[PDB]
């Protein structure tokens, strides 16, 4: 049998909208584009 695995946090960014995983932050934000909400700035206005 085998044993031994180190858990590192190299990919702290993980898009929880489509199912992806990046390394840097700039990459995530640039990908968040497609996942743009509807008028985020301000209240719900509903
Ligand atoms: Zn995504």
Swiss-Prot record:
Subcellular location(s) of the protein: Nucleus
Annotated zinc fingers (C2H2-type), start-end: 13-35
Domain of life: Eukaryota
Similarity comment: family membership: Belongs to the krueppel C2H2-type zinc-finger protein family.
Function: May be involved in transcriptional regulation.
Protein name according to UniProt: Zinc finger protein 347
Organism listed in the record: Homo sapiens
Source organism phylogeny: Eukaryota, Metazoa, Chordata, Craniata, Vertebrata
Gene giving rise to this polypeptide: ZNF347
Portion of the parent chain present: 480 to 512 of 839
């Amino acid at each position: 049998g085998s044993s031994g695995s180190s858990g590192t946090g190299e990919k702290p960014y993980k898009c929880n909208e489509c199912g992806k995983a990046f390394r840097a932050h700039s990459n995530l934000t640039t990908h968040q584009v497609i996942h743009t909400g509807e008028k985020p700035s301000g209240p719900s206005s509903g």
